[PDB]
Amino acid sequence: EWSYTNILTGPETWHEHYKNMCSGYYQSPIDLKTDISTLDLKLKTVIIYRNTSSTETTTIQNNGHSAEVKFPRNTWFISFDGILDYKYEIIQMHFHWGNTDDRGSEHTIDGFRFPLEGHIVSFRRQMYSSPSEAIGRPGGLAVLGIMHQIVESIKYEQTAFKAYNNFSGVLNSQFVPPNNSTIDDINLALLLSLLNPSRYFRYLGSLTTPPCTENVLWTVFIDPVLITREQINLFRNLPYGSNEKQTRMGDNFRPIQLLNPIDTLASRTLYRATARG
Template sequence: MGATVSQDDNDSDCHTHQSPINIWTKMALYDPFLKPLKIQYDPTTSRKIVNLGHCFNVEFDDTSDMSVLSDGPLNSRYRLRQFHFHWGSSDKDGSEHVIDGNVYPAELHIVYWNSQKYESFEEAAKHPDGLAVIGVLLKIGEANPVLQTIIEHLDDVKTKGKEHSFTKYNLARLLPNDLDYWTYHGSLTTEPYFECVTWIVLQRAIPISSAQLTRFRGLLCTSEYEKPVPIMENHRPVQLLHDRVVRSSRLVSASKL
């Protein structure tokens, strides 16, 4: 499962809706009005993999509503922008969200923006209801063939700034069958930490092998003309919950990970 951590607010400032958080499953409030997630993916919208220097993005064409997220805790339609991963220097930590004090080896973030209300991702990120992010925790297990399709292209974007074509990827196959979730209002977990995110953290983890996770750490945060420096870890510490309430789509909110 991973290490146990304490809450750390060293990263945040005076804001009170920062992410990630430690989700205590017994304190999550079951909300019978939460709807099942409605997820629509069109594999033709995947475009490229990009090394940003702190992680890699798989980016999508978000000029139309071909790949969208709606329902769940959302009141609008949100368009798929990109997904990325967070990981640690060992298999014992790396996730950003923590469940009952337990850290997982990595976490997938699938990022959407409110295309029904705003005209662009950049504009949406300025508003509390602008973005929605599905968080999926990863646990060590057998090699994940859906992840392997991505990993096979990481050498093409090994250094910062590199990008490579990545098309016809069916992101739906990466999600667990069980889409029960916890949800709360929070922030981006990288600068500028805007408090613009409706977080949807799935209650079921997906597998990744230790060897696959090692490939993530093989990416470099330096350009091809600089001394190679690997991206060993890229996860933000847990932030204080303050007066926020975490809601659960499941009546018995217990960790099923």
């Protein structure tokens, strides 16, 4: 078992409890350094798109470590090449946040932490026929990281919670693990339009929870979407699972890893994208 807040099973111990692959040298998250990174003009605008034929329901679960939206199969997709041919299929979205407004994200941008980081998880359908085939195999996954920032003055309609449909009001103190509820579908395309989908960091890394598999193509958008203090506080109402020391869910982020730990056998590079200027 693992946790974020119990020192016996917490992030500092993952490298020993889950050597495959939390002891690896292509771990995530990392500090996304604007100065150090390599601008690669070939990396294209990200597109998220829906299959309009899909009618299946979306659900959300308190899994004890995060709030996790589970999307139905064959519904939401990512394109990184401008073609809408289902190369990447979205599986779930979950969130990492802080006890306080000045931390919570897993990635940092030039050392800066955001209050909330969302992770849209997809599998390389182009190669693998199902999520469960992809999740443990090389090159199986692509995750999008969406930073959120708190503003004081904003209409609900322009916040990320409009795309999320407030998660159908499920984020509250009675949403205890491992409860799951049906929720309204999440408009992921609207969510993406709240930021610049051409402006992002790109690197090869890992899942950020055990077993930290090193099979994730990461894309982290630089511009945040916007939320309110009221909205962040809804997440903080969720209870942690019983293996955590802290009662309410918060600080559910993994500490920063190095792009290239000293023991690396082949260095990786951090890339950056921007719009055809």
